[PDB]
Amino acid sequence: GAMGKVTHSIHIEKSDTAADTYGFSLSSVEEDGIRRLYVNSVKETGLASKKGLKAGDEILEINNRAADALNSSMMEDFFSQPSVGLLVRTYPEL
Amino acid sequence: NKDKEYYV
């Protein structure tokens, strides 16, 4: 069961998808005064789902950069590219 | 408090 968090990394490519979309969203939030990035809106049978992303997973890094060191200019540049790497932190689904 | 959603 869910006790400690688990951290894992994935590398995803648009050429492995049907329609050049990974099938998830990233939520930029302020949570108790702290800026965080979360996985959200994971499409069933989409690439992100295949790679084991879950809504609510915290994104710790994108392309080897800490989430709290990103800005919107970097975000847009990163997700304009044909591929992207993520470090995420999750709980077991159950 | 969500201030942006990126759909990728």
Side-chain angles (χ1 to χ4, degrees):
Chain A
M3 292 187 70
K5 294 173 172 173
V6 176
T7 297
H8 62 101
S9 64
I10 60 174
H11 167 89
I12 50 179
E13 306 188 341
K14 287 178 187 165
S15 52
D16 293 326
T17 74
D20 257 25
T21 75
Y22 302 121
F24 74 110
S25 70
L26 297 78
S27 297
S28 174
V29 311
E30 175 262 322
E31 201 183 351
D32 309 326
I34 298 145
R35 299 226 55 95
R36 296 198 192 269
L37 276 176
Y38 284 103
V39 177
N40 214 337
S41 317
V42 184
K43 295 180 188 175
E44 223 178 354
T45 76
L47 184 54
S49 192
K50 291 178 183 295
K51 283 286 171 64
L53 294 193
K54 319 177 189 67
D57 286 357
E58 182 174 8
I59 297 158
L60 303 182
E61 300 179 355
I62 303 183
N63 298 333
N64 308 116
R65 293 168 180 271
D68 58 78
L70 304 180
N71 51 57
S72 60
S73 305
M74 299 174 66
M75 294 291 293
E76 291 177 6
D77 201 17
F78 287 172
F79 286 98
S80 187
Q81 304 315 305
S83 67
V84 65
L86 307 163
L87 183 74
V88 311
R89 190 160 61 202
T90 193
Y91 283 113
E93 207 183 85
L94 199 68
Chain B
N1 295 131
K2 197 191 296 179
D3 43 48
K4 181 172 281 171
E5 187 78 305
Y6 291 88
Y7 290 88
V8 297

PDB file of all heavy atoms in Angstrom, chain A residues 1-39:
ATOM      1  N   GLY A   1       0.794  -1.223   0.000  1.00  0.00           N
ATOM      2  CA  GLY A   1       0.000   0.000   0.000  1.00  0.00           C
ATOM      3  C   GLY A   1       0.822   1.267   0.000  1.00  0.00           C
ATOM      4  O   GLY A   1       2.040   1.218   0.178  1.00  0.00           O
ATOM      5  N   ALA A   2       0.164   2.406  -0.203  1.00  0.00           N
ATOM      6  CA  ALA A   2       0.884   3.677  -0.295  1.00  0.00           C
ATOM      7  C   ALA A   2       1.461   4.088   1.060  1.00  0.00           C
ATOM      8  O   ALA A   2       0.721   4.526   1.943  1.00  0.00           O
ATOM      9  CB  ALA A   2      -0.027   4.770  -0.832  1.00  0.00           C
ATOM     10  N   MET A   3       2.773   3.928   1.229  1.00  0.00           N
ATOM     11  CA  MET A   3       3.463   4.467   2.400  1.00  0.00           C
ATOM     12  C   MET A   3       4.391   5.607   1.976  1.00  0.00           C
ATOM     13  O   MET A   3       4.057   6.793   2.157  1.00  0.00           O
ATOM     14  CB  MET A   3       4.235   3.364   3.141  1.00  0.00           C
ATOM     15  CG  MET A   3       3.328   2.331   3.809  1.00  0.00           C
ATOM     16  SD  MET A   3       4.250   1.155   4.828  1.00  0.00           S
ATOM     17  CE  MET A   3       4.766   2.202   6.197  1.00  0.00           C
ATOM     18  N   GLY A   4       5.538   5.266   1.393  1.00  0.00           N
ATOM     19  CA  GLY A   4       6.471   6.288   0.939  1.00  0.00           C
ATOM     20  C   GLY A   4       6.221   6.601  -0.525  1.00  0.00           C
ATOM     21  O   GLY A   4       5.557   5.841  -1.232  1.00  0.00           O
ATOM     22  N   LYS A   5       6.738   7.735  -0.980  1.00  0.00           N
ATOM     23  CA  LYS A   5       6.632   8.099  -2.381  1.00  0.00           C
ATOM     24  C   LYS A   5       7.691   7.380  -3.209  1.00  0.00           C
ATOM     25  O   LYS A   5       8.758   7.029  -2.694  1.00  0.00           O
ATOM     26  CB  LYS A   5       6.789   9.601  -2.551  1.00  0.00           C
ATOM     27  CG  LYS A   5       5.666  10.398  -1.919  1.00  0.00           C
ATOM     28  CD  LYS A   5       5.968  11.897  -1.967  1.00  0.00           C
ATOM     29  CE  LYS A   5       4.749  12.695  -1.511  1.00  0.00           C
ATOM     30  NZ  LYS A   5       5.078  14.142  -1.385  1.00  0.00           N
ATOM     31  N   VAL A   6       7.404   7.193  -4.490  1.00  0.00           N
ATOM     32  CA  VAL A   6       8.354   6.555  -5.396  1.00  0.00           C
ATOM     33  C   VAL A   6       8.713   7.509  -6.526  1.00  0.00           C
ATOM     34  O   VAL A   6       7.840   8.153  -7.103  1.00  0.00           O
ATOM     35  CB  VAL A   6       7.780   5.245  -5.956  1.00  0.00           C
ATOM     36  CG1 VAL A   6       8.726   4.626  -6.981  1.00  0.00           C
ATOM     37  CG2 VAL A   6       7.510   4.270  -4.798  1.00  0.00           C
ATOM     38  N   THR A   7      10.005   7.618  -6.819  1.00  0.00           N
ATOM     39  CA  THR A   7      10.477   8.543  -7.846  1.00  0.00           C
ATOM     40  C   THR A   7      10.971   7.768  -9.045  1.00  0.00           C
ATOM     41  O   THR A   7      11.764   6.839  -8.895  1.00  0.00           O
ATOM     42  CB  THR A   7      11.609   9.431  -7.315  1.00  0.00           C
ATOM     43  OG1 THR A   7      11.110  10.240  -6.251  1.00  0.00           O
ATOM     44  CG2 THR A   7      12.161  10.331  -8.403  1.00  0.00           C
ATOM     45  N   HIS A   8      10.490   8.126 -10.233  1.00  0.00           N
ATOM     46  CA  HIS A   8      10.970   7.478 -11.444  1.00  0.00           C
ATOM     47  C   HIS A   8      11.050   8.464 -12.610  1.00  0.00           C
ATOM     48  O   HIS A   8      10.428   9.533 -12.594  1.00  0.00           O
ATOM     49  CB  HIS A   8      10.084   6.275 -11.797  1.00  0.00           C
ATOM     50  CG  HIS A   8       8.649   6.625 -12.080  1.00  0.00           C
ATOM     51  ND1 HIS A   8       8.147   6.720 -13.357  1.00  0.00           N
ATOM     52  CD2 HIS A   8       7.608   6.861 -11.245  1.00  0.00           C
ATOM     53  CE1 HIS A   8       6.857   7.023 -13.302  1.00  0.00           C
ATOM     54  NE2 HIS A   8       6.505   7.102 -12.031  1.00  0.00           N
ATOM     55  N   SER A   9      11.841   8.115 -13.614  1.00  0.00           N
ATOM     56  CA  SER A   9      11.999   8.975 -14.769  1.00  0.00           C
ATOM     57  C   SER A   9      11.595   8.253 -16.034  1.00  0.00           C
ATOM     58  O   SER A   9      11.755   7.028 -16.148  1.00  0.00           O
ATOM     59  CB  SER A   9      13.433   9.455 -14.903  1.00  0.00           C
ATOM     60  OG  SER A   9      14.268   8.342 -15.147  1.00  0.00           O
ATOM     61  N   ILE A  10      11.075   9.029 -16.977  1.00  0.00           N
ATOM     62  CA  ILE A  10      10.666   8.522 -18.279  1.00  0.00           C
ATOM     63  C   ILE A  10      11.087   9.494 -19.355  1.00  0.00           C
ATOM     64  O   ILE A  10      11.276  10.675 -19.101  1.00  0.00           O
ATOM     65  CB  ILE A  10       9.153   8.309 -18.372  1.00  0.00           C
ATOM     66  CG1 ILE A  10       8.420   9.638 -18.131  1.00  0.00           C
ATOM     67  CG2 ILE A  10       8.712   7.221 -17.382  1.00  0.00           C
ATOM     68  CD1 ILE A  10       6.901   9.548 -18.340  1.00  0.00           C
ATOM     69  N   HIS A  11      11.249   8.978 -20.562  1.00  0.00           N
ATOM     70  CA  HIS A  11      11.567   9.808 -21.709  1.00  0.00           C
ATOM     71  C   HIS A  11      10.517   9.499 -22.758  1.00  0.00           C
ATOM     72  O   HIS A  11      10.329   8.334 -23.116  1.00  0.00           O
ATOM     73  CB  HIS A  11      12.985   9.523 -22.221  1.00  0.00           C
ATOM     74  CG  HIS A  11      13.271  10.120 -23.570  1.00  0.00           C
ATOM     75  ND1 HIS A  11      13.780  11.388 -23.729  1.00  0.00           N
ATOM     76  CD2 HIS A  11      13.114   9.616 -24.816  1.00  0.00           C
ATOM     77  CE1 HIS A  11      13.924  11.645 -25.017  1.00  0.00           C
ATOM     78  NE2 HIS A  11      13.518  10.589 -25.699  1.00  0.00           N
ATOM     79  N   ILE A  12       9.783  10.510 -23.215  1.00  0.00           N
ATOM     80  CA  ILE A  12       8.696  10.219 -24.141  1.00  0.00           C
ATOM     81  C   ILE A  12       8.889  10.972 -25.462  1.00  0.00           C
ATOM     82  O   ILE A  12       9.434  12.070 -25.476  1.00  0.00           O
ATOM     83  CB  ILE A  12       7.315  10.546 -23.513  1.00  0.00           C
ATOM     84  CG1 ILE A  12       7.324  11.941 -22.914  1.00  0.00           C
ATOM     85  CG2 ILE A  12       6.981   9.527 -22.410  1.00  0.00           C
ATOM     86  CD1 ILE A  12       6.009  12.375 -22.301  1.00  0.00           C
ATOM     87  N   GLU A  13       8.463  10.354 -26.564  1.00  0.00           N
ATOM     88  CA  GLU A  13       8.637  10.939 -27.897  1.00  0.00           C
ATOM     89  C   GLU A  13       7.309  11.044 -28.645  1.00  0.00           C
ATOM     90  O   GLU A  13       6.520  10.101 -28.657  1.00  0.00           O
ATOM     91  CB  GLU A  13       9.643  10.109 -28.702  1.00  0.00           C
ATOM     92  CG  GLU A  13      10.972   9.942 -27.953  1.00  0.00           C
ATOM     93  CD  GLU A  13      12.061   9.296 -28.784  1.00  0.00           C
ATOM     94  OE1 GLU A  13      11.736   8.649 -29.799  1.00  0.00           O
ATOM     95  OE2 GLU A  13      13.250   9.446 -28.416  1.00  0.00           O
ATOM     96  N   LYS A  14       7.064  12.188 -29.278  1.00  0.00           N
ATOM     97  CA  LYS A  14       5.827  12.364 -30.024  1.00  0.00           C
ATOM     98  C   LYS A  14       5.673  11.342 -31.158  1.00  0.00           C
ATOM     99  O   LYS A  14       4.540  10.993 -31.514  1.00  0.00           O
ATOM    100  CB  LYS A  14       5.738  13.792 -30.577  1.00  0.00           C
ATOM    101  CG  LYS A  14       5.436  14.832 -29.493  1.00  0.00           C
ATOM    102  CD  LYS A  14       5.399  16.234 -30.071  1.00  0.00           C
ATOM    103  CE  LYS A  14       5.275  17.299 -28.977  1.00  0.00           C
ATOM    104  NZ  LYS A  14       5.607  18.664 -29.539  1.00  0.00           N
ATOM    105  N   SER A  15       6.785  10.839 -31.704  1.00  0.00           N
ATOM    106  CA  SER A  15       6.702   9.847 -32.794  1.00  0.00           C
ATOM    107  C   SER A  15       6.186   8.469 -32.328  1.00  0.00           C
ATOM    108  O   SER A  15       5.878   7.592 -33.152  1.00  0.00           O
ATOM    109  CB  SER A  15       8.060   9.698 -33.490  1.00  0.00           C
ATOM    110  OG  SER A  15       9.105   9.436 -32.565  1.00  0.00           O
ATOM    111  N   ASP A  16       6.063   8.290 -31.017  1.00  0.00           N
ATOM    112  CA  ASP A  16       5.487   7.078 -30.454  1.00  0.00           C
ATOM    113  C   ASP A  16       4.002   7.247 -30.148  1.00  0.00           C
ATOM    114  O   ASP A  16       3.397   6.404 -29.475  1.00  0.00           O
ATOM    115  CB  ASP A  16       6.225   6.680 -29.182  1.00  0.00           C
ATOM    116  CG  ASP A  16       7.656   6.250 -29.451  1.00  0.00           C
ATOM    117  OD1 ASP A  16       7.898   5.656 -30.531  1.00  0.00           O
ATOM    118  OD2 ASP A  16       8.535   6.511 -28.594  1.00  0.00           O
ATOM    119  N   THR A  17       3.413   8.341 -30.618  1.00  0.00           N
ATOM    120  CA  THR A  17       2.004   8.599 -30.367  1.00  0.00           C
ATOM    121  C   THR A  17       1.246   8.639 -31.678  1.00  0.00           C
ATOM    122  O   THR A  17       1.841   8.823 -32.739  1.00  0.00           O
ATOM    123  CB  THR A  17       1.780   9.928 -29.628  1.00  0.00           C
ATOM    124  OG1 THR A  17       1.988  11.021 -30.531  1.00  0.00           O
ATOM    125  CG2 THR A  17       2.728  10.061 -28.417  1.00  0.00           C
ATOM    126  N   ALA A  18      -0.072   8.483 -31.603  1.00  0.00           N
ATOM    127  CA  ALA A  18      -0.890   8.476 -32.811  1.00  0.00           C
ATOM    128  C   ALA A  18      -1.029   9.858 -33.418  1.00  0.00           C
ATOM    129  O   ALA A  18      -1.039  10.009 -34.641  1.00  0.00           O
ATOM    130  CB  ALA A  18      -2.269   7.912 -32.511  1.00  0.00           C
ATOM    131  N   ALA A  19      -1.143  10.873 -32.567  1.00  0.00           N
ATOM    132  CA  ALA A  19      -1.502  12.198 -33.056  1.00  0.00           C
ATOM    133  C   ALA A  19      -0.642  13.301 -32.462  1.00  0.00           C
ATOM    134  O   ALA A  19      -1.117  14.421 -32.278  1.00  0.00           O
ATOM    135  CB  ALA A  19      -2.983  12.473 -32.776  1.00  0.00           C
ATOM    136  N   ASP A  20       0.620  12.979 -32.178  1.00  0.00           N
ATOM    137  CA  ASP A  20       1.603  13.950 -31.714  1.00  0.00           C
ATOM    138  C   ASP A  20       1.205  14.572 -30.387  1.00  0.00           C
ATOM    139  O   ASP A  20       1.581  15.709 -30.090  1.00  0.00           O
ATOM    140  CB  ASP A  20       1.827  15.053 -32.760  1.00  0.00           C
ATOM    141  CG  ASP A  20       3.117  14.863 -33.542  1.00  0.00           C
ATOM    142  OD1 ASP A  20       3.596  13.707 -33.657  1.00  0.00           O
ATOM    143  OD2 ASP A  20       3.658  15.873 -34.036  1.00  0.00           O
ATOM    144  N   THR A  21       0.427  13.843 -29.592  1.00  0.00           N
ATOM    145  CA  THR A  21       0.118  14.297 -28.246  1.00  0.00           C
ATOM    146  C   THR A  21       0.414  13.146 -27.291  1.00  0.00           C
ATOM    147  O   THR A  21       0.139  11.994 -27.605  1.00  0.00           O
ATOM    148  CB  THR A  21      -1.348  14.789 -28.092  1.00  0.00           C
ATOM    149  OG1 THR A  21      -2.245  13.676 -28.057  1.00  0.00           O
ATOM    150  CG2 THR A  21      -1.745  15.727 -29.238  1.00  0.00           C
ATOM    151  N   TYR A  22       1.025  13.475 -26.157  1.00  0.00           N
ATOM    152  CA  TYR A  22       1.411  12.487 -25.138  1.00  0.00           C
ATOM    153  C   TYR A  22       0.218  12.015 -24.325  1.00  0.00           C
ATOM    154  O   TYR A  22       0.243  10.953 -23.717  1.00  0.00           O
ATOM    155  CB  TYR A  22       2.445  13.076 -24.176  1.00  0.00           C
ATOM    156  CG  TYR A  22       3.735  13.586 -24.800  1.00  0.00           C
ATOM    157  CD1 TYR A  22       4.131  14.915 -24.643  1.00  0.00           C
ATOM    158  CD2 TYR A  22       4.578  12.727 -25.494  1.00  0.00           C
ATOM    159  CE1 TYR A  22       5.320  15.380 -25.189  1.00  0.00           C
ATOM    160  CE2 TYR A  22       5.769  13.178 -26.036  1.00  0.00           C
ATOM    161  CZ  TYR A  22       6.138  14.498 -25.883  1.00  0.00           C
ATOM    162  OH  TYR A  22       7.328  14.944 -26.434  1.00  0.00           O
ATOM    163  N   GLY A  23      -0.822  12.831 -24.272  1.00  0.00           N
ATOM    164  CA  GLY A  23      -2.031  12.424 -23.581  1.00  0.00           C
ATOM    165  C   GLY A  23      -1.978  12.651 -22.079  1.00  0.00           C
ATOM    166  O   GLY A  23      -2.460  11.821 -21.297  1.00  0.00           O
ATOM    167  N   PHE A  24      -1.393  13.775 -21.672  1.00  0.00           N
ATOM    168  CA  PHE A  24      -1.510  14.221 -20.281  1.00  0.00           C
ATOM    169  C   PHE A  24      -1.412  15.731 -20.200  1.00  0.00           C
ATOM    170  O   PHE A  24      -1.058  16.396 -21.175  1.00  0.00           O
ATOM    171  CB  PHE A  24      -0.449  13.563 -19.390  1.00  0.00           C
ATOM    172  CG  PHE A  24       0.959  14.100 -19.575  1.00  0.00           C
ATOM    173  CD1 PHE A  24       1.556  14.861 -18.582  1.00  0.00           C
ATOM    174  CD2 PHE A  24       1.695  13.795 -20.709  1.00  0.00           C
ATOM    175  CE1 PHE A  24       2.851  15.338 -18.720  1.00  0.00           C
ATOM    176  CE2 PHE A  24       2.992  14.264 -20.856  1.00  0.00           C
ATOM    177  CZ  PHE A  24       3.570  15.037 -19.860  1.00  0.00           C
ATOM    178  N   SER A  25      -1.749  16.288 -19.048  1.00  0.00           N
ATOM    179  CA  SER A  25      -1.568  17.710 -18.893  1.00  0.00           C
ATOM    180  C   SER A  25      -0.659  17.964 -17.690  1.00  0.00           C
ATOM    181  O   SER A  25      -0.455  17.064 -16.879  1.00  0.00           O
ATOM    182  CB  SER A  25      -2.924  18.417 -18.750  1.00  0.00           C
ATOM    183  OG  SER A  25      -3.531  18.121 -17.519  1.00  0.00           O
ATOM    184  N   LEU A  26      -0.082  19.163 -17.614  1.00  0.00           N
ATOM    185  CA  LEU A  26       0.722  19.580 -16.462  1.00  0.00           C
ATOM    186  C   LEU A  26       0.037  20.766 -15.821  1.00  0.00           C
ATOM    187  O   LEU A  26      -0.228  21.765 -16.509  1.00  0.00           O
ATOM    188  CB  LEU A  26       2.152  19.982 -16.853  1.00  0.00           C
ATOM    189  CG  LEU A  26       3.152  19.005 -17.475  1.00  0.00           C
ATOM    190  CD1 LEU A  26       2.851  18.789 -18.952  1.00  0.00           C
ATOM    191  CD2 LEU A  26       4.558  19.529 -17.321  1.00  0.00           C
ATOM    192  N   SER A  27      -0.247  20.653 -14.526  1.00  0.00           N
ATOM    193  CA  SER A  27      -0.893  21.707 -13.748  1.00  0.00           C
ATOM    194  C   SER A  27       0.143  22.526 -13.007  1.00  0.00           C
ATOM    195  O   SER A  27       0.891  21.993 -12.204  1.00  0.00           O
ATOM    196  CB  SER A  27      -1.881  21.119 -12.736  1.00  0.00           C
ATOM    197  OG  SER A  27      -2.950  20.423 -13.365  1.00  0.00           O
ATOM    198  N   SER A  28       0.185  23.821 -13.275  1.00  0.00           N
ATOM    199  CA  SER A  28       1.046  24.693 -12.514  1.00  0.00           C
ATOM    200  C   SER A  28       0.242  25.250 -11.355  1.00  0.00           C
ATOM    201  O   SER A  28      -0.773  25.919 -11.569  1.00  0.00           O
ATOM    202  CB  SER A  28       1.605  25.817 -13.383  1.00  0.00           C
ATOM    203  OG  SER A  28       2.332  26.738 -12.578  1.00  0.00           O
ATOM    204  N   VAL A  29       0.677  24.963 -10.128  1.00  0.00           N
ATOM    205  CA  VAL A  29      -0.093  25.377  -8.967  1.00  0.00           C
ATOM    206  C   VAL A  29       0.757  26.070  -7.912  1.00  0.00           C
ATOM    207  O   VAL A  29       1.976  25.901  -7.857  1.00  0.00           O
ATOM    208  CB  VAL A  29      -0.815  24.187  -8.289  1.00  0.00           C
ATOM    209  CG1 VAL A  29      -1.586  23.345  -9.308  1.00  0.00           C
ATOM    210  CG2 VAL A  29       0.173  23.326  -7.516  1.00  0.00           C
ATOM    211  N   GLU A  30       0.093  26.878  -7.094  1.00  0.00           N
ATOM    212  CA  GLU A  30       0.683  27.394  -5.867  1.00  0.00           C
ATOM    213  C   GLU A  30       0.021  26.636  -4.743  1.00  0.00           C
ATOM    214  O   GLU A  30      -1.197  26.674  -4.592  1.00  0.00           O
ATOM    215  CB  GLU A  30       0.472  28.902  -5.718  1.00  0.00           C
ATOM    216  CG  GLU A  30       0.957  29.483  -4.384  1.00  0.00           C
ATOM    217  CD  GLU A  30      -0.183  29.657  -3.383  1.00  0.00           C
ATOM    218  OE1 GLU A  30      -1.296  30.040  -3.809  1.00  0.00           O
ATOM    219  OE2 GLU A  30       0.027  29.396  -2.178  1.00  0.00           O
ATOM    220  N   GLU A  31       0.827  25.920  -3.975  1.00  0.00           N
ATOM    221  CA  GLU A  31       0.311  25.033  -2.949  1.00  0.00           C
ATOM    222  C   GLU A  31       0.967  25.393  -1.624  1.00  0.00           C
ATOM    223  O   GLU A  31       2.162  25.152  -1.439  1.00  0.00           O
ATOM    224  CB  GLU A  31       0.583  23.568  -3.324  1.00  0.00           C
ATOM    225  CG  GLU A  31      -0.313  22.566  -2.630  1.00  0.00           C
ATOM    226  CD  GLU A  31       0.039  21.137  -2.985  1.00  0.00           C
ATOM    227  OE1 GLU A  31       0.877  20.937  -3.901  1.00  0.00           O
ATOM    228  OE2 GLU A  31      -0.504  20.216  -2.335  1.00  0.00           O
ATOM    229  N   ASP A  32       0.192  25.988  -0.719  1.00  0.00           N
ATOM    230  CA  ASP A  32       0.728  26.481   0.546  1.00  0.00           C
ATOM    231  C   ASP A  32       1.939  27.375   0.311  1.00  0.00           C
ATOM    232  O   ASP A  32       2.972  27.217   0.962  1.00  0.00           O
ATOM    233  CB  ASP A  32       1.111  25.322   1.468  1.00  0.00           C
ATOM    234  CG  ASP A  32      -0.004  24.310   1.625  1.00  0.00           C
ATOM    235  OD1 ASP A  32      -1.190  24.709   1.614  1.00  0.00           O
ATOM    236  OD2 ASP A  32       0.307  23.110   1.755  1.00  0.00           O
ATOM    237  N   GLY A  33       1.813  28.295  -0.642  1.00  0.00           N
ATOM    238  CA  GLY A  33       2.862  29.260  -0.914  1.00  0.00           C
ATOM    239  C   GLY A  33       4.002  28.734  -1.764  1.00  0.00           C
ATOM    240  O   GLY A  33       4.916  29.477  -2.087  1.00  0.00           O
ATOM    241  N   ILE A  34       3.955  27.457  -2.130  1.00  0.00           N
ATOM    242  CA  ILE A  34       5.036  26.853  -2.907  1.00  0.00           C
ATOM    243  C   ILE A  34       4.597  26.502  -4.328  1.00  0.00           C
ATOM    244  O   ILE A  34       3.525  25.928  -4.526  1.00  0.00           O
ATOM    245  CB  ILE A  34       5.565  25.591  -2.215  1.00  0.00           C
ATOM    246  CG1 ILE A  34       6.137  25.956  -0.842  1.00  0.00           C
ATOM    247  CG2 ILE A  34       6.604  24.898  -3.095  1.00  0.00           C
ATOM    248  CD1 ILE A  34       5.914  24.889   0.207  1.00  0.00           C
ATOM    249  N   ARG A  35       5.422  26.839  -5.315  1.00  0.00           N
ATOM    250  CA  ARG A  35       5.094  26.524  -6.703  1.00  0.00           C
ATOM    251  C   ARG A  35       5.429  25.071  -7.050  1.00  0.00           C
ATOM    252  O   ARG A  35       6.558  24.608  -6.836  1.00  0.00           O
ATOM    253  CB  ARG A  35       5.815  27.488  -7.647  1.00  0.00           C
ATOM    254  CG  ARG A  35       5.392  28.939  -7.413  1.00  0.00           C
ATOM    255  CD  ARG A  35       5.103  29.673  -8.716  1.00  0.00           C
ATOM    256  NE  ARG A  35       4.107  28.968  -9.521  1.00  0.00           N
ATOM    257  CZ  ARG A  35       2.801  29.231  -9.509  1.00  0.00           C
ATOM    258  NH1 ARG A  35       2.311  30.198  -8.735  1.00  0.00           N
ATOM    259  NH2 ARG A  35       1.984  28.525 -10.280  1.00  0.00           N
ATOM    260  N   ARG A  36       4.439  24.344  -7.568  1.00  0.00           N
ATOM    261  CA  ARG A  36       4.638  22.944  -7.926  1.00  0.00           C
ATOM    262  C   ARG A  36       4.089  22.640  -9.314  1.00  0.00           C
ATOM    263  O   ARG A  36       3.265  23.378  -9.837  1.00  0.00           O
ATOM    264  CB  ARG A  36       3.982  22.034  -6.892  1.00  0.00           C
ATOM    265  CG  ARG A  36       4.607  22.146  -5.504  1.00  0.00           C
ATOM    266  CD  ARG A  36       4.234  20.949  -4.644  1.00  0.00           C
ATOM    267  NE  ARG A  36       4.578  21.173  -3.243  1.00  0.00           N
ATOM    268  CZ  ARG A  36       5.737  20.832  -2.693  1.00  0.00           C
ATOM    269  NH1 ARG A  36       6.675  20.242  -3.423  1.00  0.00           N
ATOM    270  NH2 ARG A  36       5.960  21.081  -1.409  1.00  0.00           N
ATOM    271  N   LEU A  37       4.581  21.572  -9.927  1.00  0.00           N
ATOM    272  CA  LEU A  37       4.046  21.118 -11.194  1.00  0.00           C
ATOM    273  C   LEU A  37       3.505  19.725 -10.971  1.00  0.00           C
ATOM    274  O   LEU A  37       4.193  18.870 -10.434  1.00  0.00           O
ATOM    275  CB  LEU A  37       5.112  21.101 -12.294  1.00  0.00           C
ATOM    276  CG  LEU A  37       5.461  22.352 -13.102  1.00  0.00           C
ATOM    277  CD1 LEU A  37       6.623  22.058 -14.065  1.00  0.00           C
ATOM    278  CD2 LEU A  37       4.257  22.840 -13.879  1.00  0.00           C
ATOM    279  N   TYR A  38       2.273  19.500 -11.389  1.00  0.00           N
ATOM    280  CA  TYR A  38       1.641  18.200 -11.248  1.00  0.00           C
ATOM    281  C   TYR A  38       1.210  17.634 -12.596  1.00  0.00           C
ATOM    282  O   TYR A  38       0.793  18.383 -13.478  1.00  0.00           O
ATOM    283  CB  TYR A  38       0.418  18.306 -10.341  1.00  0.00           C
ATOM    284  CG  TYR A  38       0.727  18.416  -8.866  1.00  0.00           C
ATOM    285  CD1 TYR A  38       0.650  19.638  -8.211  1.00  0.00           C
ATOM    286  CD2 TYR A  38       1.062  17.291  -8.124  1.00  0.00           C
ATOM    287  CE1 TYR A  38       0.915  19.736  -6.859  1.00  0.00           C
ATOM    288  CE2 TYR A  38       1.335  17.382  -6.777  1.00  0.00           C
ATOM    289  CZ  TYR A  38       1.254  18.601  -6.147  1.00  0.00           C
ATOM    290  OH  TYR A  38       1.510  18.682  -4.793  1.00  0.00           O
ATOM    291  N   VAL A  39       1.296  16.312 -12.726  1.00  0.00           N
ATOM    292  CA  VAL A  39       0.644  15.592 -13.803  1.00  0.00           C
ATOM    293  C   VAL A  39      -0.854  15.632 -13.563  1.00  0.00           C
ATOM    294  O   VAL A  39      -1.306  15.463 -12.436  1.00  0.00           O
ATOM    295  CB  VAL A  39       1.105  14.104 -13.875  1.00  0.00           C
ATOM    296  CG1 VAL A  39       0.341  13.358 -14.959  1.00  0.00           C
ATOM    297  CG2 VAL A  39       2.605  14.013 -14.104  1.00  0.00           C
TER     298      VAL A  39
END
